Amino acid sequence: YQDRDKPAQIRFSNISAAKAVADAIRTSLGPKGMDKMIQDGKGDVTITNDGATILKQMQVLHPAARMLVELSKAQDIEAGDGTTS
């Protein structure tokens, strides 16, 4: 083929950036889910398994990764549970 215009490079960039967010948070699912160490830029650290709190501290610049943050916020407004799911 040729494909002078390649939209797939944006599709593959959006999928890879979106999957990278779900790959980290998936370990916190369930009561037995593992914890994490979040080190803020000032040097402060904390330990929490809450998925909604971690996503607010991610500070994602990628557009596809930002829509997942807004997706988790819309779930807490309607049902209020199942943010990580």
Partner: protein, 182 residues
Amino acid sequence: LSVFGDRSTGETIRSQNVMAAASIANIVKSSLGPVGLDKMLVDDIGDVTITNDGATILKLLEVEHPAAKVLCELADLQDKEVGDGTTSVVIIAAELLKNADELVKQKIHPTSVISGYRLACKEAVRYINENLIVNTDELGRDCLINAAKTSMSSKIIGINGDFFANMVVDAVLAIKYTDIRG
């Protein structure tokens, strides 16, 4: 992926936390016991502080690691609640992580490892409570003169064993006063 910081996971993170906790233990390791050696503490000004107390070292020790600050706060809870054995807690807590990290390389999930320590620590308290001993040797029997005789055998005062130690027993028995609720 575009992020403002670094992110890493895997067996390396758990390995770094075990090696960090092992470094704090090795510092207070050789200082355990009454014969433990002294250790210097150097500040940024260049002053030196020397002592064998493990509880004093951990308070003045400064090492920046996420996991290392957990054990430092742990000694404060043991000190404020009881005040003795803070050195033994740090040493045991490190040996637990050394053997647990080996089980992870055996493909043992950490949850099964955590469930083991909770059952082992629970059965340990039950077995200790049976092997305990209450207050005794206050009447009808004396092996309590040998109580202070062992601690006095390491000094020149231990030349006469029963002469000097008999007055220590009569001193601690004469000072008994309730002052609260029996």
